[PDB]
Nucleic acid binder design. Structure first.
Ligand SMILES: N[C@@H](CC(=O)O)C(=O)O
Ligand SMILES: [Mg+2]
Ligand SMILES: [Mg+2]
Ligand SMILES: [Mg+2]
Ligand SMILES: [Mg+2]
Ligand SMILES: [Mg+2]
Ligand SMILES: [Mg+2]
Ligand SMILES: [Mg+2]
Ligand SMILES: [Mg+2]
Ligand SMILES: [Mg+2]
Ligand SMILES: [Mg+2]
Ligand SMILES: [Mg+2]
Ligand SMILES: [Mg+2]
Ligand SMILES: [Mg+2]
Ligand SMILES: [Mg+2]
Ligand SMILES: [Mg+2]
Ligand SMILES: [Mg+2]
Ligand SMILES: [Mg+2]
Ligand SMILES: [Mg+2]
Ligand SMILES: [Mg+2]
Ligand SMILES: [Mg+2]
Ligand SMILES: [Mg+2]
Ligand SMILES: [Mg+2]
Ligand SMILES: [Mg+2]
Ligand SMILES: [Mg+2]
Ligand SMILES: [Mg+2]
Ligand SMILES: [Mg+2]
Ligand SMILES: [Mg+2]
Lengths: 386, 78, 136
RNA sequence: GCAGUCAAGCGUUCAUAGCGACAUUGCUUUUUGAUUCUUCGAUGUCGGCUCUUCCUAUCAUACCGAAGCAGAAUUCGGUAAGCGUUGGAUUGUUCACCCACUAAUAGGGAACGUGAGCUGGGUUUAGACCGUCGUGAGACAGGUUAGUUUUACCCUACUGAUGAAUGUUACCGCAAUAGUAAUUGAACUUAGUACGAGAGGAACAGUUCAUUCGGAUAAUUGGUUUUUGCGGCUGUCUGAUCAGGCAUUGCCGCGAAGCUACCAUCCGCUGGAUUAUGGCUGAACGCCUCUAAGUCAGAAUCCAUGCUAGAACGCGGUGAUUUC
RNA sequence: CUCUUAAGGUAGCCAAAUGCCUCGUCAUCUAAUUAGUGACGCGCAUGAAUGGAUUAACGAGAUUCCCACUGUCCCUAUCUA
RNA sequence: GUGAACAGCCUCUAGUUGAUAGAAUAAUGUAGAUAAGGGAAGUCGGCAAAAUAGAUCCGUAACUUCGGGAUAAGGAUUGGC
């Protein structure tokens, strides 16, 4: 017989299978379509999620009831120290897809990056690239031919970058490595641009800009084996149900004599890779600068880090990217930031944003003060003080 | 952005923090957190809660603030 | 919302499902309202229709002046008692639930309104704004 | 139950705008029947709850043709099953009937889908009461009340989770295949405009929001307390104080961290090819015609972009490759 | 007035645990009630120790409504062994 | 001892320290709990849970077989010195 009362599907079928991701660093599967006119520049960046805070700003939206009035918004901050460029690779089209044909590496590799190639670093003779470095010390013989190859072929060029993990408060000691597609024109200059940038660093400012809409790509937070109710949000069974009530009643009809793939079942939850789009940048911060949390309206010297530092992370002594809303993945997880794939007008993506005030109260409790000087002023002298 | 004063504890309330409660007599109360909100619901008296500003004002504790106002006692010279 | 809605209302947390009884805030002689429906509400299996501040509901008076009972009539809520969020980030809530009896196109049956009324409701129904004592 | 063919009439005139008698051709097995082919060394037999998928004989949404389409509203039909189709009073109810919102509250299948998923209201043992029938034991899809609902560790299917073998190990990659998602409404303006004598009364573009669903997140608000963190309180015990035990977490208030809520916040892309239909050129048929060759525009359609896995017997680049 | 019986249901009561038609008809309770209650009765087939109708108190009996209460529900979340 | 009490809780004399254990704290379970706003809208049906609860003072309807209903309903107080 037919279903008595109609109801929408539970869950989305475009995200199956709900299995653990292959790696902790989500891989970007698409890049913005290249334009052979703009100068050579990156299309993405690497950073680490720090935390969230609150912002007050004047909305600029003609027509809404809150035109030219203050609103509060929730934002998240990603600590983004400048990445280091080490080598580039090229890809050539095939009737079976893009294929890599040659990889080149820089002469000197730092320890934090060459630790990526070892599962037991402390017991090792540190023999990494020790014969590749010998490919130098001759003018350009063993390398300039490789570059000539890449110039002659390899319609698409990607560059290898790695994070400066030691600059963060993490206890990782092992940097992250990733590919970023260049987006200039005339690949010969793309590879030229990479050449002098070998072993050099790239600041996030060189890639991103204020009020620019971007995309966040990272592996979401995991929760272990999860029941079907919380995994899919299906209706809970009535109370007086024998043999459990946190289940699904009918997992399939008699025929076909199998349980369909579309029936919600218990299993893993979280730790999937997710791609979130249309996030606006609210502030690009320069790390070697106090008064990051200061605005043109506030004008009190205070950094972006809250009282007592970000919970479970620490301070933001490096550069950072500040973005409206929520991004996938929890704190201390690697996150990839990608430029937009299409020109988005929306009458919203191009709204200029000027902050009024940035919250820096303690997130380890119901913080009441913004600065230790303010706290001392309010509370007066204590027993601890002299 | 305007900062207000907690109606019970006297603490400062930054934007987006705490709650606001409108009583039937159209009187407005603000609270910085749930601790104060609950104490107000329990109908406690602030003057008997040892850590609130109104209590300290009533007991002259930590009151090394403002001292006096000096007004000259002489000819105007104008 | 609907015929008398002079503007649009941002979503605010629903605190009045069907069956809720709220005080009557006007001088129409009714003393309480019993919600049985919410105008402009969607449909989802086992989802109880719910009302929030500023909505228009179809309701009956359960106890009050006899010439009002035993018939359905539109009403507009003015007090919620469930905390909701403005743009400002302030969370506010009254201490009771309150509504006013009105005709289908927004004409108030009473003449005056006792107690405070929410700003979103005043801004959405001009007539209750005019007949409003205190607006918060 | 649904759809055709003929045409006496209805429709101010007029058969086919919309209907359509007397006749007549068909389809379905979701109703009820006919037979008794399989099961009586047992296939658990109504309904309700929850959940997935499929059909079109399409209620709304998309795009169009026609009217006894001035506008508004409405009716008939075409491509269309992607998306949605409710909250309640009474009844075990299928069905039925009323209240109300909504764009709409369409019809059906999956062993009359679904009891080792639930319930047991009815049916469906034994107790009992009433009415009718019988002299009597007793009978009544006539009424009422109380009546034990078993087992998964096996194989397969599904959700997740390891893993030998391709000289070893590590890093960065490609993408065959499989899945796919967003949906609808309101207000302002257009505009009291077009149309209409009037009463009445639109639409395209633009702005702000909202309904259902989905994926995340916890800066703020709320919840949860074994943080047994702090304070308080009752009985009893340690001679008293201090500081503690016991009362199966003793109770009360607050209560960080974590988890979590349309009860909180953020986000949900743009190109091509088409269906119905309207056309261009133009014969067949010296005229004419969207059609025969050719071609243009076109829908919530299809395929791409994008999103999720990544063949454990699909593939590429790179580092290091052991001596007593 | 008439046929027939031994007599032809009186006092009472009722869609009741007894009425198929039946969700009887009217009123009330609700926005809406095949439920409940109060009336009517040519009652398939109510009715007098086969006992009829009420009845204070009593009932781990059955049923309807109201107040307080609450995760039964909107809509799920968390903690302990 | 507390307390109206051979009620519940703690202790003295007396008697036991027995019930396969160790490590973690996923889903679903069994037992125990808490939840903002609404308050039975779920369901055949308030099934399960929650609300009241001791003592002192005030007040106590219809009906009746005059004995009851009655702790009716509904209010106020409760520590220590
Ligand atoms: N199996 C039975 C029934 C015949 O027919
Ligand atoms: Mg259906
Ligand atoms: Mg969720
Ligand atoms: Mg059971
Ligand atoms: Mg915190
Ligand atoms: Mg809290
Ligand atoms: Mg339901
Ligand atoms: Mg047979
Ligand atoms: Mg048989
Ligand atoms: Mg057999
Ligand atoms: Mg079987
Ligand atoms: Mg069709
Ligand atoms: Mg129901
Ligand atoms: Mg059938
Ligand atoms: Mg079924
Ligand atoms: Mg079965
Ligand atoms: Mg029996
Ligand atoms: Mg007899
Ligand atoms: Mg029978
Ligand atoms: Mg099992
Ligand atoms: Mg594909
Ligand atoms: Mg908390
Ligand atoms: Mg022509
Ligand atoms: Mg008898
Ligand atoms: Mg005593
Ligand atoms: Mg005793
Ligand atoms: Mg044992
Ligand atoms: Mg007293």
């Amino acid at each position: 017989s037919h279903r008595k009362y109609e109801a929408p599907r539970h869950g989305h079928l475009g995200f199956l299978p709900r299995k653990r991701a292959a790696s902790i660093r989500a891989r970007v599967k698409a890049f913005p379509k290249d334009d052979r006119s703009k100068p050579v520049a990156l299309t993405s960046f690497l950073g680490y999620k720090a935390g969230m805070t609150t912002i007050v700003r004047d909305l600029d939206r003609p027509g809404s009831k809150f035109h030219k009035r203050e609103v509060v918004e929730a934002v998240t901050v990603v600590d983004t120290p400048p990445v280091v460029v080490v080598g580039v690779v090229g890809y050539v089209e095939t009737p079976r897809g893009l294929r890599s044909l040659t990889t080149v590496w820089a002469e000197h590799l730092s320890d934090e990056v060459k630790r990526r190639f070892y599962k037991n670093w402390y017991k090792s003779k540190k023999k990494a690239f020790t014969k590749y470095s010998a490919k130098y010390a001759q003018d350009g013989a063993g390398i300039e031919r490789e570059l000539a190859r890449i110039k002659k072929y390899a319609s698409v060029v990607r560059v290898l970058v790695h994070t400066q993990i030691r600059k963060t408060p993490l206890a990782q000691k092992k940097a992250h490595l990733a590919e970023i597609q260049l987006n200039g024109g005339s690949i010969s200059e793309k590879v030229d641009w990479a050449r002098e940038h070998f072993e050099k660093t790239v600041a996030v400012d060189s890639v991103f800009e204020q009020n620019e809409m971007i995309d966040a790509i990272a592996v979401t937070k995991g929760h272990g084996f999860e029941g079907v109710t919380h995994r899919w949000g299906t209706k809970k069974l009535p109370r007086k149900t024998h043999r459990g009530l946190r289940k699904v009643a009918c997992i399939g009809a008699w025929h076909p004599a199998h349980v369909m793939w579309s029936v919600a079942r218990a299993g893993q939850r979280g730790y999937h890779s997710r791609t979130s789009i249309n996030h606006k940048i609210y502030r690009v911060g320069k790390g070697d600068d106090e008064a990051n949390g200061a605005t043109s309206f506030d004008r009190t010297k205070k950094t972006i880090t809250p009282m007592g530092g970000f919970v479970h992370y620490g301070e933001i002594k490096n550069d950072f990217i500040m973005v409206k809303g929520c991004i996938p993945g929890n704190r201390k997880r690697i996150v990839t930031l990608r430029k937009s794939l299409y020109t988005n007008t929306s009458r919203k993506a191009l709204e200029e944003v000027s902050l009024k005030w940035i919250d820096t109260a303690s997130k380890f409790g119901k913080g009441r003060f913004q600065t230790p000087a303010e706290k001392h002023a309010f509370m007066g002298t204590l027993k601890k003080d002299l | 952005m305007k900062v207000e004063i907690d109606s019970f504890s006297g603490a400062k309330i930054y934007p987006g923090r705490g709650t606001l409660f409108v009583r039937g007599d159209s009187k407005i109360f603000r609270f910085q957190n749930s601790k104060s909100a609950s104490l107000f619901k329990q109908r406690k008296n602030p003057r008997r809660i040892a850590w609130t500003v109104l209590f300290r004002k009533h007991h002259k504790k930590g009151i090394t603030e403002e001292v006096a106002k000096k007004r000259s006692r002489k000819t105007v010279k104008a | 919302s609907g015929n008398g809605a002079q503007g649009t209302k941002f979503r605010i947390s629903l605190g009045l499902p069907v069956g809720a009884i709220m005080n009557c805030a006007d001088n129409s002689g009714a003393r309480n309202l019993y919600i049985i429906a919410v105008k402009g509400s969607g449909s989802r299996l086992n989802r109880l229709p719910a009302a929030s501040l500023g909505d228009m509901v179809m309701a009956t008076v359960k106890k009050g002046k006899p010439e009002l009972r035993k018939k359905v009539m539109p009403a507009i809520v003015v007090r919620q008692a469930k905390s909701w969020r403005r743009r400002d980030g302030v969370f506010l809530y009254f201490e009771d639930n309150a509504g006013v009896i009105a005709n289908p196109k927004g004409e108030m049956k009473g003449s005056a309104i006792t107690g405070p009324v929410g700003k979103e409701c005043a801004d959405l129904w001009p007539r209750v704004a005019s007949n409003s004592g205190v607006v918060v």
